[PDB]
Design a protein around this nucleic acid. Structure first.
Ligand code: RIV
Ligand code: CA
Ligand code: NA
Lengths: 231, 51
RNA sequence: GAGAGCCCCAGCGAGAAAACGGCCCCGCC
Protein backbone atom coordinates (compact mmCIF):
# COMPACT_ATOMS: atom_id res chain seq x y z
CA UNK A 1 0.00 0.00 0.00
CA UNK A 2 1.22 3.50 -0.93
CA UNK A 3 0.32 6.01 1.79
CA UNK A 4 -2.51 5.02 4.14
CA UNK A 5 -1.98 3.74 7.70
CA UNK A 6 -1.01 0.55 9.54
CA UNK A 7 -3.80 -1.84 10.42
CA UNK A 8 -3.95 -1.52 14.21
CA UNK A 9 -4.78 -4.50 16.37
CA UNK A 10 -7.95 -6.18 15.13
CA UNK A 11 -8.65 -3.61 12.37
CA UNK A 12 -8.10 -5.80 9.25
CA UNK A 13 -8.83 -9.32 10.50
CA UNK A 14 -10.07 -10.54 7.05
CA UNK A 15 -6.62 -9.97 5.50
CA UNK A 16 -4.96 -13.13 4.19
CA UNK A 17 -1.40 -13.33 2.88
CA UNK A 18 -0.41 -15.76 0.12
CA UNK A 19 3.14 -16.98 0.82
CA UNK A 20 5.47 -18.85 -1.55
CA UNK A 21 8.03 -21.66 -0.87
CA UNK A 22 10.51 -19.17 0.68
CA UNK A 23 7.85 -17.77 3.09
CA UNK A 24 7.80 -14.52 1.08
CA UNK A 25 4.37 -12.90 0.82
CA UNK A 26 3.41 -12.16 -2.81
CA UNK A 27 -0.37 -11.65 -2.87
CA UNK A 28 -3.23 -10.82 -0.54
CA UNK A 29 -6.49 -12.63 0.10
CA UNK A 30 -9.80 -12.07 1.91
CA UNK A 31 -11.15 -14.51 4.50
CA UNK A 32 -14.76 -15.40 3.60
CA UNK A 33 -15.35 -18.33 5.92
CA UNK A 34 -13.45 -20.90 8.02
CA UNK A 35 -12.57 -22.82 4.83
CA UNK A 36 -12.59 -20.18 2.03
CA UNK A 37 -10.25 -17.37 0.89
CA UNK A 38 -11.05 -14.88 -1.90
CA UNK A 39 -8.12 -13.86 -4.10
CA UNK A 40 -7.13 -12.78 -7.64
CA UNK A 41 -6.80 -15.35 -10.42
CA UNK A 42 -3.50 -13.81 -11.60
CA UNK A 43 -2.00 -14.50 -8.13
CA UNK A 44 -2.04 -18.20 -9.09
CA UNK A 45 0.67 -17.49 -11.73
CA UNK A 46 3.20 -15.78 -9.42
CA UNK A 47 4.46 -18.59 -7.14
CA UNK A 48 5.31 -22.19 -8.01
CA UNK A 49 3.32 -23.33 -4.96
CA UNK A 50 1.92 -21.44 -1.95
CA UNK A 51 0.11 -21.46 1.40
CA UNK A 52 -2.16 -18.92 3.13
CA UNK A 53 -1.08 -17.04 6.28
CA UNK A 54 -3.75 -15.38 8.44
CA UNK A 55 -3.68 -13.25 11.57
CA UNK A 56 -0.38 -11.58 10.69
CA UNK A 57 0.36 -7.86 11.09
CA UNK A 58 4.16 -7.54 11.32
CA UNK A 59 6.05 -10.08 9.18
CA UNK A 60 9.44 -9.22 10.70
CA UNK A 61 8.28 -10.41 14.17
CA UNK A 62 6.60 -13.84 13.90
CA UNK A 63 5.23 -14.25 17.41
CA UNK A 64 1.50 -14.14 18.22
CA UNK A 65 -1.58 -15.67 16.63
CA UNK A 66 -0.49 -16.22 13.02
CA UNK A 67 -1.34 -19.49 11.30
CA UNK A 68 -0.38 -20.93 7.91
CA UNK A 69 -3.07 -23.02 6.18
CA UNK A 70 -2.46 -25.40 3.27
CA UNK A 71 -4.66 -25.06 0.16
CA UNK A 72 -6.75 -28.16 -0.60
CA UNK A 73 -8.51 -26.66 -3.64
CA UNK A 74 -7.93 -23.77 -6.05
CA UNK A 75 -11.07 -22.55 -7.82
CA UNK A 76 -9.99 -20.17 -10.58
CA UNK A 77 -12.67 -18.49 -12.70
CA UNK A 78 -12.63 -20.36 -16.06
CA UNK A 79 -12.78 -17.04 -17.97
CA UNK A 80 -9.73 -15.35 -16.43
CA UNK A 81 -7.30 -13.93 -19.07
CA UNK A 82 -3.84 -12.44 -18.44
CA UNK A 83 -4.10 -10.45 -21.71
CA UNK A 84 -6.87 -8.28 -20.16
CA UNK A 85 -6.96 -9.30 -16.43
CA UNK A 86 -10.72 -9.77 -16.98
CA UNK A 87 -12.45 -12.17 -14.54
CA UNK A 88 -9.63 -11.68 -12.07
CA UNK A 89 -11.00 -13.85 -9.28
CA UNK A 90 -10.30 -17.16 -7.58
CA UNK A 91 -11.43 -18.95 -4.44
CA UNK A 92 -9.18 -21.16 -2.33
CA UNK A 93 -10.54 -23.97 -0.16
CA UNK A 94 -8.24 -24.75 2.78
CA UNK A 95 -7.45 -28.26 4.08
CA UNK A 96 -7.91 -27.08 7.72
CA UNK A 97 -10.59 -24.73 9.11
CA UNK A 98 -9.48 -21.31 10.31
CA UNK A 99 -10.07 -20.70 14.02
CA UNK A 100 -11.47 -17.17 14.27
CA UNK A 101 -9.70 -15.13 16.95
CA UNK A 102 -8.11 -11.69 17.44
CA UNK A 103 -6.94 -10.50 13.98
CA UNK A 104 -8.70 -13.47 12.25
CA UNK A 105 -12.31 -12.97 11.15
CA UNK A 106 -14.16 -13.11 7.80
CA UNK A 107 -15.51 -10.18 5.79
CA UNK A 108 -19.24 -10.25 4.90
CA UNK A 109 -20.54 -11.19 1.43
CA UNK A 110 -23.34 -8.74 0.64
CA UNK A 111 -26.43 -9.47 -1.44
CA UNK A 112 -25.79 -8.15 -4.98
CA UNK A 113 -28.58 -5.58 -5.59
CA UNK A 114 -28.03 -4.07 -2.12
CA UNK A 115 -24.28 -4.03 -2.74
CA UNK A 116 -24.89 -2.15 -6.00
CA UNK A 117 -27.37 0.35 -4.56
CA UNK A 118 -25.80 0.85 -1.11
CA UNK A 119 -22.09 -0.16 -0.97
CA UNK A 120 -20.85 0.82 -4.47
CA UNK A 121 -22.58 4.20 -4.04
CA UNK A 122 -20.57 5.01 -0.86
CA UNK A 123 -17.87 7.68 -1.10
CA UNK A 124 -15.03 5.26 -0.32
CA UNK A 125 -13.92 1.71 0.39
CA UNK A 126 -10.90 0.31 2.24
CA UNK A 127 -8.01 -1.55 0.63
CA UNK A 128 -5.33 -3.39 2.61
CA UNK A 129 -2.19 -5.48 2.29
CA UNK A 130 1.49 -6.21 2.72
CA UNK A 131 2.55 -4.83 -0.68
CA UNK A 132 5.00 -2.09 -1.64
CA UNK A 133 4.98 1.42 -0.17
CA UNK A 134 5.92 2.97 -3.49
CA UNK A 135 6.20 1.74 -7.03
CA UNK A 136 9.67 -3.35 -2.25
CA UNK A 137 7.23 -4.80 0.27
CA UNK A 138 5.82 -3.67 3.61
CA UNK A 139 6.75 -5.65 6.69
CA UNK A 140 3.56 -4.30 8.29
CA UNK A 141 -0.03 -4.72 7.16
CA UNK A 142 -1.46 -1.42 5.91
CA UNK A 143 -4.88 -0.08 5.01
CA UNK A 144 -6.01 2.80 2.84
CA UNK A 145 -9.29 4.58 2.17
CA UNK A 146 -9.89 4.76 -1.61
CA UNK A 147 -12.67 6.80 -3.19
CA UNK A 148 -14.86 5.06 -5.75
CA UNK A 149 -14.13 6.57 -9.16
CA UNK A 150 -16.82 6.70 -11.87
CA UNK A 151 -16.45 4.24 -14.76
CA UNK A 152 -16.16 6.88 -17.51
CA UNK A 153 -13.25 8.63 -15.74
CA UNK A 154 -11.62 5.24 -15.11
CA UNK A 155 -11.96 4.24 -18.81
CA UNK A 156 -10.56 7.54 -20.11
CA UNK A 157 -7.71 7.23 -17.59
CA UNK A 158 -6.67 3.68 -18.63
CA UNK A 159 -4.33 2.24 -21.25
CA UNK A 160 -6.14 -1.13 -20.98
CA UNK A 161 -9.77 -2.07 -21.43
CA UNK A 162 -11.83 -1.61 -18.25
CA UNK A 163 -14.50 -4.34 -18.33
CA UNK A 164 -17.76 -4.52 -16.34
CA UNK A 165 -15.96 -7.00 -14.07
CA UNK A 166 -13.67 -4.12 -12.95
CA UNK A 167 -13.97 -0.79 -11.11
CA UNK A 168 -11.62 2.06 -10.29
CA UNK A 169 -10.75 3.42 -6.88
CA UNK A 170 -8.15 5.78 -5.46
CA UNK A 171 -6.92 9.22 -6.46
CA UNK A 172 -6.02 11.21 -9.53
CA UNK A 173 -2.73 12.75 -8.28
CA UNK A 174 -2.63 12.08 -4.50
CA UNK A 175 0.11 9.58 -3.64
CA UNK A 176 -2.11 6.84 -2.29
CA UNK A 177 -2.95 3.54 -3.97
CA UNK A 178 -2.51 -0.19 -3.68
CA UNK A 179 0.71 -1.57 -5.17
CA UNK A 180 2.68 -4.67 -6.18
CA UNK A 181 2.09 -7.34 -3.53
CA UNK A 182 -1.42 -6.17 -2.57
CA UNK A 183 -3.11 -8.07 -5.44
CA UNK A 184 -5.79 -10.53 -4.41
CA UNK A 185 -6.36 -8.66 -1.15
CA UNK A 186 -9.51 -7.06 0.31
CA UNK A 187 -11.36 -4.05 -0.93
CA UNK A 188 -14.15 -3.77 1.64
CA UNK A 189 -16.86 -1.19 2.15
CA UNK A 190 -18.04 -0.11 5.55
CA UNK A 191 -21.73 0.24 6.28
CA UNK A 192 -22.80 0.89 9.91
CA UNK A 193 -19.59 -0.57 11.44
CA UNK A 194 -19.78 -3.77 9.34
CA UNK A 195 -17.34 -4.41 6.49
CA UNK A 196 -18.53 -6.03 3.27
CA UNK A 197 -16.37 -7.44 0.46
CA UNK A 198 -16.72 -5.10 -2.56
CA UNK A 199 -13.50 -5.70 -4.54
CA UNK A 200 -10.34 -7.66 -5.08
CA UNK A 201 -7.06 -5.78 -5.65
CA UNK A 202 -6.37 -6.63 -9.29
CA UNK A 203 -4.02 -4.25 -11.12
CA UNK A 204 -2.87 -0.71 -11.84
CA UNK A 205 -0.41 0.94 -14.19
CA UNK A 206 2.34 1.35 -11.68
CA UNK A 207 1.23 2.66 -8.28
CA UNK A 208 -0.15 6.10 -7.27
CA UNK A 209 0.70 7.54 -10.72
CA UNK A 210 -0.97 10.81 -11.66
CA UNK A 211 -4.01 10.26 -13.91
CA UNK A 212 -4.15 6.54 -13.07
CA UNK A 213 -6.24 4.62 -10.54
CA UNK A 214 -6.33 1.26 -8.78
CA UNK A 215 -8.28 -1.36 -10.74
CA UNK A 216 -10.32 -3.80 -8.63
CA UNK A 217 -12.32 -6.91 -9.55
CA UNK A 218 -15.99 -5.95 -9.16
CA UNK A 219 -17.11 -8.55 -6.61
CA UNK A 220 -20.77 -7.75 -7.18
CA UNK A 221 -20.51 -9.35 -10.66
CA UNK A 222 -19.08 -12.50 -8.99
CA UNK A 223 -21.31 -13.00 -5.92
CA UNK A 224 -23.18 -15.83 -7.64
CA UNK A 225 -19.93 -17.42 -8.90
CA UNK A 226 -18.53 -17.10 -5.33
CA UNK A 227 -21.59 -18.86 -3.79
CA UNK A 228 -21.18 -21.70 -6.31
CA UNK A 229 -17.45 -21.92 -5.58
CA UNK A 230 -18.16 -22.15 -1.83
CA UNK A 231 -20.39 -25.25 -2.56
CA UNK B 1 -38.33 3.10 1.38
CA UNK B 2 -34.82 1.50 1.00
CA UNK B 3 -33.49 4.82 -0.35
CA UNK B 4 -34.57 6.58 2.89
CA UNK B 5 -31.61 5.73 5.13
CA UNK B 6 -31.53 2.06 4.05
CA UNK B 7 -35.11 1.56 5.35
CA UNK B 8 -33.74 1.78 8.93
CA UNK B 9 -32.08 -1.67 8.37
CA UNK B 10 -28.66 -2.56 9.85
CA UNK B 11 -27.59 -4.46 6.75
CA UNK B 12 -29.59 -5.57 3.68
CA UNK B 13 -32.78 -3.70 2.73
CA UNK B 14 -35.25 -4.85 0.03
CA UNK B 15 -38.59 -3.40 -1.10
CA UNK B 16 -41.36 -5.99 -1.03
CA UNK B 17 -45.13 -5.40 -1.56
CA UNK B 18 -44.67 -1.59 -1.17
CA UNK B 19 -42.80 -2.14 2.17
CA UNK B 20 -39.23 -2.38 3.56
CA UNK B 21 -37.80 -5.82 4.43
CA UNK B 22 -34.51 -6.05 6.37
CA UNK B 23 -32.15 -9.00 6.36
CA UNK B 24 -28.67 -9.90 7.52
CA UNK B 25 -25.55 -11.71 6.30
CA UNK B 26 -24.90 -15.32 7.36
CA UNK B 27 -23.83 -15.39 11.02
CA UNK B 28 -26.39 -12.72 12.00
CA UNK B 29 -29.99 -13.04 13.22
CA UNK B 30 -32.65 -10.40 12.53
CA UNK B 31 -33.62 -8.72 15.84
CA UNK B 32 -37.14 -8.56 17.35
CA UNK B 33 -37.57 -5.12 15.76
CA UNK B 34 -37.13 -6.62 12.24
CA UNK B 35 -34.29 -4.18 11.49
CA UNK B 36 -31.16 -4.73 13.64
CA UNK B 37 -28.76 -7.60 12.93
CA UNK B 38 -27.47 -9.63 15.88
CA UNK B 39 -24.26 -11.71 15.87
CA UNK B 40 -24.89 -15.40 16.64
CA UNK B 41 -21.25 -16.11 17.68
CA UNK B 42 -18.05 -14.32 18.82
CA UNK B 43 -16.52 -13.60 15.35
CA UNK B 44 -19.33 -12.47 13.03
CA UNK B 45 -18.37 -11.43 9.54
CA UNK B 46 -17.34 -7.85 8.85
CA UNK B 47 -16.58 -6.88 12.48
CA UNK B 48 -13.19 -5.63 13.57
CA UNK B 49 -11.92 -7.87 16.42
CA UNK B 50 -11.49 -6.68 20.03
CA UNK B 51 -10.36 -9.79 22.04
C1' G C 1 -35.47 -12.92 -22.66
C1' A C 2 -35.24 -17.58 -25.76
C1' G C 3 -32.41 -21.28 -29.32
C1' A C 4 -28.56 -22.70 -31.50
C1' G C 5 -23.02 -22.94 -32.65
C1' C C 6 -18.49 -22.92 -30.79
C1' C C 7 -14.88 -21.40 -26.98
C1' C C 8 -13.63 -22.06 -21.72
C1' C C 9 -13.99 -25.59 -17.67
C1' A C 10 -7.77 -25.04 -11.15
C1' G C 11 -15.51 -26.66 -8.74
C1' C C 12 -19.07 -31.69 -8.59
C1' G C 13 -18.73 -36.46 -12.04
C1' A C 14 -15.60 -39.64 -15.23
C1' G C 15 -10.78 -40.92 -16.64
C1' A C 16 -5.34 -41.10 -17.13
C1' A C 17 4.82 -37.92 -12.99
C1' A C 18 -1.53 -34.99 -8.38
C1' A C 19 -2.70 -24.92 -14.94
C1' C C 20 -3.46 -33.01 -16.41
C1' G C 21 -16.92 -32.70 -20.71
C1' G C 22 -22.51 -35.60 -18.15
C1' C C 23 -23.72 -31.47 -14.36
C1' C C 24 -23.65 -26.29 -11.11
C1' C C 25 -21.58 -21.11 -11.86
C1' C C 26 -19.71 -18.45 -16.27
C1' G C 27 -18.11 -16.27 -21.95
C1' C C 28 -18.43 -15.11 -26.94
C1' C C 29 -25.41 -16.53 -34.69
O1 RIV D 1 -0.42 -4.51 -8.58
C1 RIV D 1 -0.50 -3.40 -9.07
N1 RIV D 1 0.36 -2.98 -10.00
C2 RIV D 1 1.78 -3.26 -9.90
C3 RIV D 1 2.32 -3.70 -11.25
C4 RIV D 1 1.28 -4.58 -11.97
N2 RIV D 1 1.09 -3.79 -13.17
C5 RIV D 1 0.21 -4.19 -14.19
C6 RIV D 1 -0.07 -5.54 -14.38
C7 RIV D 1 -0.95 -5.93 -15.39
C8 RIV D 1 -1.54 -4.97 -16.20
N3 RIV D 1 -2.43 -5.36 -17.21
C9 RIV D 1 -3.65 -4.59 -17.38
C10 RIV D 1 -4.73 -5.63 -17.69
O2 RIV D 1 -4.33 -6.42 -18.81
C11 RIV D 1 -3.22 -7.25 -18.50
C12 RIV D 1 -2.09 -6.41 -17.96
O3 RIV D 1 -0.93 -6.70 -18.20
C13 RIV D 1 -1.27 -3.62 -16.01
C14 RIV D 1 -0.39 -3.23 -15.00
C15 RIV D 1 1.79 -2.69 -13.24
O4 RIV D 1 1.79 -1.87 -14.15
O5 RIV D 1 2.61 -2.55 -12.06
C16 RIV D 1 -1.58 -2.48 -8.64
C17 RIV D 1 -1.67 -1.08 -8.56
C18 RIV D 1 -2.90 -0.64 -8.09
C19 RIV D 1 -3.72 -1.72 -7.81
CL1 RIV D 1 -5.43 -1.51 -7.16
S1 RIV D 1 -3.04 -3.28 -8.12
CA1 CA E 1 3.82 -11.40 12.67
NA1 NA F 1 -3.34 8.04 -9.02
Amino acid sequence: IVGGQECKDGECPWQALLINEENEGFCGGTILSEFYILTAAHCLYQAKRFKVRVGDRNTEQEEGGEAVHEVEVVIKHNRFTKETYDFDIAVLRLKTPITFRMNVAPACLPERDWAESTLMTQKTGIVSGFGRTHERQSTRLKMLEVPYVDRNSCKLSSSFIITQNMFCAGYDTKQEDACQGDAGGPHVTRFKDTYFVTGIVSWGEGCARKGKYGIYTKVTAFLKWIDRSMK
Amino acid sequence: LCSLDNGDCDQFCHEEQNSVVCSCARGYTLADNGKACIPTGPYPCGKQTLE
